[PDB]
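Researcher: Let's try something more involved. This one mixes different molecule types, so please make sure each is placed in the same coordinate frame as the others.
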Amino acid sequence: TQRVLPYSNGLYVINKGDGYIRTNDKDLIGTLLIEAGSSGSIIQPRLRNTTRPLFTTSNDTKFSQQYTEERLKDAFNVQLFNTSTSLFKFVEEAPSDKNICIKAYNTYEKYELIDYQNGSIVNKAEYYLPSLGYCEVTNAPSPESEVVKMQVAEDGFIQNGPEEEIVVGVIDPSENIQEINTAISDNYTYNIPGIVNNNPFYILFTVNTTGIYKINAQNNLPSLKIYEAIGSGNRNFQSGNLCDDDIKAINYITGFDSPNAKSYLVVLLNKDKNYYIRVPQTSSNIENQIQFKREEGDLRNLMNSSVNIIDNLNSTGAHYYTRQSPDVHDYISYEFTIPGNFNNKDTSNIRLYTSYNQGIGTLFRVTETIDGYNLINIQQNLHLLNNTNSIRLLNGAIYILKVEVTELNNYNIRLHIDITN
Amino acid sequence: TQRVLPYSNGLYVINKGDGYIRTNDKDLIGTLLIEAGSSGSIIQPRLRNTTRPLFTTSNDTKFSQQYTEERLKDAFNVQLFNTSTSLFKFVEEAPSDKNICIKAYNTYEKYELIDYQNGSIVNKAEYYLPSLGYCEVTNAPSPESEVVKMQVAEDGFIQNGPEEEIVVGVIDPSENIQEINTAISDNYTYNIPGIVNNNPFYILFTVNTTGIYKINAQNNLPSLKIYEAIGSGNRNFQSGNLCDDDIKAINYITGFDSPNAKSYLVVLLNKDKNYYIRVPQTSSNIENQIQFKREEGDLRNLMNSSVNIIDNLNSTGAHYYTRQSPDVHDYISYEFTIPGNFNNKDTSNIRLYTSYNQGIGTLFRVTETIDGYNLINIQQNLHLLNNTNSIRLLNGAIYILKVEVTELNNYNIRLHIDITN
Amino acid sequence: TQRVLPYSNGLYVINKGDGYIRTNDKDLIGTLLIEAGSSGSIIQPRLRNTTRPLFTTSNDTKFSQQYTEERLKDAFNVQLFNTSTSLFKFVEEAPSDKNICIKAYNTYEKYELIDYQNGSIVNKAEYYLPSLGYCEVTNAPSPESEVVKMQVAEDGFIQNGPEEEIVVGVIDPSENIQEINTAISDNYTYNIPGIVNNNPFYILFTVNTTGIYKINAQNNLPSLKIYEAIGSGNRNFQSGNLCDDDIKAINYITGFDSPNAKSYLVVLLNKDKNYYIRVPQTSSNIENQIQFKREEGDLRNLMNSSVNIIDNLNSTGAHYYTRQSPDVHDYISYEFTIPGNFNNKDTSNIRLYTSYNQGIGTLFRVTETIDGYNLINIQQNLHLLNNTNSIRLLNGAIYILKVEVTELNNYNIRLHIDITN
Amino acid sequence: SDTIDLADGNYVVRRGDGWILSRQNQILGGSVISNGSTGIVGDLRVNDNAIPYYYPTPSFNEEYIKNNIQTVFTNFTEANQIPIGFEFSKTAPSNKNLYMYLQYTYIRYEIIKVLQHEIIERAVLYVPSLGYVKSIEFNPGEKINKDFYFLTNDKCILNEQFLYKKILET
Amino acid sequence: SDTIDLADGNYVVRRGDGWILSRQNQILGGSVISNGSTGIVGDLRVNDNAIPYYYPTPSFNEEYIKNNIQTVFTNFTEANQIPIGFEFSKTAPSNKNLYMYLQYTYIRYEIIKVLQHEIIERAVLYVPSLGYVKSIEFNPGEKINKDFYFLTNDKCILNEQFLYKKILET
Amino acid sequence: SDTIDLADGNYVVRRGDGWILSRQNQILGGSVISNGSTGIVGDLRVNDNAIPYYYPTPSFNEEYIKNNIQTVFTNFTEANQIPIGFEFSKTAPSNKNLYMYLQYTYIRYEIIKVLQHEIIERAVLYVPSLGYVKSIEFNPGEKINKDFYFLTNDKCILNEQFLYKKILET
Ligand SMILES: [Cl-]
Ligand SMILES: [Cl-]
Ligand SMILES: [Cl-]
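Model: All components are placed in one shared frame. Result:
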């Protein structure tokens, strides 16, 4: 009954909430018995600034305490781990009727750092950052009830703060960040530099005018991924240039981890924002370029998604294509050519379906003119999961299927293209 | 019109209450004139920890300041004399009608240390421990009344806190504390060790089972005293053993200071408590033993008291016996033999009375069987003070008179045993 | 439309009020947005004692910062300029209805130091002493109105505290203070010592009995001025002696700055007060004495004023005499002799008037007896401003005109004495 | 008695917060407030008022007590280096006098040895926690109960607890 | 857009107090209070929480930003050496739980270059000011809006301002 | 006058708490609070604001004054080494402005010489005590009485006292 985590490969820092305390009163500050009419206070006055974070990791040699702290700083800008100047204090006035007890606890805000790779967690660490306390008030204990003995709880934490799950991607620090210093207009070609050979790397860029862009490597290999720098563009600014604010907190937009899959990105980019492209490890010594192109015509209909180029569709029968599934409400697209000679008459029956995830598809006929690519919407509201409906398409013609995921049942999405005639 | 202090010889620390201030504004912190509607506060924030105790003594060379402090620590566990981390602060909101004044004073908690010996104080010291203040509020002074001149008061103190007299006996530190490491069951014989020759010393012991015990030295000489260690047995514990918590605060139970008086102790001892026997200075070089015996029979009726053995009753006429009087509701007992041959017929008229203190007596006939001592109650509710009633008792027979003091008019109690025939 | 400042030549420190802040938020501490029901506080806890006074001067080489500070200490006893142990804190509880903002500012108390000489300011400095803050509360800002751009204000201050102008004269520190150590009774002659030759200097003295005194130099030259030491005589005291408390804060009473004008002072002096006479720079090497005389007769009618001796009135026609004008409700007097031989019959018409200031005059006939000077009131309620009324007075006779200023229109007062016959 | 439904062996036991100690009750002093005023007393737990009270036994010495308590329950050596404050406020009613006094509270821990459903040995540790004020309105010359001022035996002002973990051998 | 009715040249601009920064909102921690109690959180602006955030440009480096801001507006280098405190109080209603968390606020300053009624370059300085608390009452298991916890873009919790002075050449 | 029904000789006299000194009234500064807010000002008596003001005479020099005052009355040299705080709170009414200012108060002591029912010599000592705030609600441009701001002669804000002890010869 595990949630499918449709996260792109990478590092994530997750704020799992505030108000955590350990079991068996390890974080109890103490209890005040306050008599009726009176008041009492428990105070953390920071006469000393020292705090005590707690840390556990699955991998001391990558996710050390230092590294994790650097990640929490990348994600949320946390800078004080060992210290605090933030005071907290709890005050309780007992009612006129009855006596009152207040128990105060130290608390932690829990951060989880994960390395997520191909559908599972491969490195994990938990950093509990000292927080600003928990105060429970209760009626005065009566005599004596009686004392009933109790075994200690297992070691662990109990959350007393509100539910919270804030997921923030972070730049992998082992990878270089290259910059495109000029803001991108209608067209740009980025040559891949030998200073970052073979290793995956990031490209930081920004755009002159808000618009939809197509982005790809030569011959659409390798596949690329694109992220937005969270909170970028709110600050310094220079017309037609990139302003780098060293933001390492990233929101995944679209793109595949499998580098041998041909694809291109179609994405809406804001001029008041910075973006990172990640180019993966390529096992080839040939020169490559990243191409950027502003789209003014029908290709805009494909935002935001990666478009997989399907190449091996040259016989009749069954064909399937497996990719990481987008999350709910996100898109994946497929561009394919119906086998056979294009003679504008010869036709084939085509069945399009998924195996496990539900998705809404729209099918486009593609024709390239001298004015660019044209997309004719020929089929709307296709429900893909175990679809039995079929449609006759032209031999040798080119189609794009755009899929919106609506039910995420499997980490992968498997598109079937079954062709008969 | 002096109170009789029926204290056993020894040292006592007395808490005489809190809220003491010196005369002539020596401890005035200051006054705030607070206008109507407004509030004011006077604060002792312990930015410095220094405090100023006051001390006077009758005897610098025994009751020095150091010694007295050691006594206050023995009695009440006071450990900070020169310093304090305890904050105090007074707040006053003036009513909407009128202006208001608050005057704040430093205060002291007054401790008296006494050495009490044979019915009077022979050494005395007063230790005034810095306390947590006194705040008086008054209406605003009017113009101008007029100023009337006043001579200064004599030097001294005024108490502004509530009435208090808590008396706590303390172990004399010039005397050795020997220990009986095994808990006492039905019988035990403690040999008096040469490491503590001639000097008075204490014996710390505890008991296995709650019960009434008879305790005495060889031939009931010397007389002994017994104390309870206040708050003992609440903590560490080992089955069948003594656990010494170094408690020097002692509650006198019973026993005489006059060491040439033959006596034995009959006392209820709790298993969850520690006790101290004091054996006095003995002017004899002979070996002695303290004997402990659990009482299961009639001797239990004598708890808690010392039983004086009366030896010199061998003629008719008047006889008197002077001892320190127990306090109100406490007991003293006397075991005596009617002069003459026991022939079970020859009898004598006996008059029993006290001179100054009122006491209720009960008279027991004593017979020793092979099953122990038997006590037959032959006379109840004897009112001893100037008693004129007389009773016929058997010549040569043995009797125990148990006396409960009900009116304490004299430091001593004088029992008369007048015998005619 | 300038106020006439009728100040005597000298130095003055003026407290111009509290609650000053600079323009353009230079002294903004910050703003708290407090949600409804909740409270917020801004606190200056003096964890560091440092403060930042602001200072401007017209003359760095006389009115340096050090000198000015010494003056503020002379005037108001300010002693801490760079530091403060005085805490301030602002608290606001937002109502149940709406959110609330509090803005807190640092403030200054503004002091102006002036050197005032012959009717204008010749040196000026402004010392802004760090104060205890300003807190404005406002309703929560709504979205978004809209932001309207604004140019910055000129540099300067805005006062947020209440109106205040407290003017305090101070002793000029470049001048010696000589003392008359014996308290003055009916008569005293002070010889002017060579240790203070030629330079102006002060004489500090006090009086045995409250009374009206005439004070003058030999032949009424030079003219003198007298001041009261503010707050003198409230403290230490020795019968018949001066007690000097080093008070440099002075209240001008009367006397002229023009040293070649013949005059004498008639002044009410209190025995519980100290006074300073200033004797000016004299350009003569001859020996001089200050004379003090208790007045018991009619000369008392001239308090408090300087009496100008008019000497050059020996022909008929127009005559005028210019002096610094007293302030409103203060007095100036003139003693003059009608030209001609006194033969008790020959008479002259006399017109007395001022040019610009309104004043009420009373005219006295003066006769010297062997019992002293006698003053006969011969004219009351003279309105001097452009007076056209005239009176016949005796040739060779002596008169004193006492003038109370009631309308101050000019820094100078010009008395005209027009004589016809 | 000292009978307990547990197997044989040694145990750490947390007996709860809120314990106050005999004899010690007034040694910090108290305040007298009058006629509508408010008195506030507090303290600051650091260093040399946070030193704990050990009561060891032949089986259970001090280090054994410290190490077993700090493993299972709160590490008081680390915690008590960091100052924590606490305060109490009392308000005197009009035309009356109020006396209020302060004492420390402690967590009580125990190491017990159990043999045949019986506690045959017990070591105790008191770790300073926070504090507790008692107050009384009084008249001049009014006699006050000794019990208000002076505690004969340790007690818990809250409900006692018995939270246990069995200790396993080296 | 970035269009402004000003002449050509460079300007210092004070954009007002009350700015909070993206991502950073919960890094100081928060308090949970319950059932009638009052929670108070605060901080102390000195030294190393008063270090400002610079965002320079090719024309406007850090020293240019500091020197022009401190001339016209508040000298934050002098001011922030002297500790200033601030606190907020929240009271939990009966039988409810309240979570409150703290973040710093900043004055936002800008140096802008204007050419032909257009801002073509902008440098930014955030100077720490005071702080700001947000609170919410919550039930066990209740889902909370992400927005309550996490800020995507810098914003002003007060009204924004635009107070400008033209900078004149060396 | 200076007439007193006492025998001949020298006397220490305590003249009471609550004295304020001329000219000095506003030198600590004041606060302006507005529209429902509360202003709190205070100070801390230690070291160099607790240095007393001596006014000796030919008979009674400073050491004579100090030694006779400290013998009979409070030893201010010992007392004033230990910091004592005091605070005052004022609340501004709605839509009004309030100004509040602080000054120190002093105990006034005197050494007097009496001859034939007459004080012929008097030395004075002012020892810093606590403080005192005055407040006023004001409108913009409203003229304020000079007396509110500035004190011409020392006075006592409480009732004056005259508590005396005769000094006996060395
Ligand atoms: Cl699927
Ligand atoms: Cl008797
Ligand atoms: Cl005129």
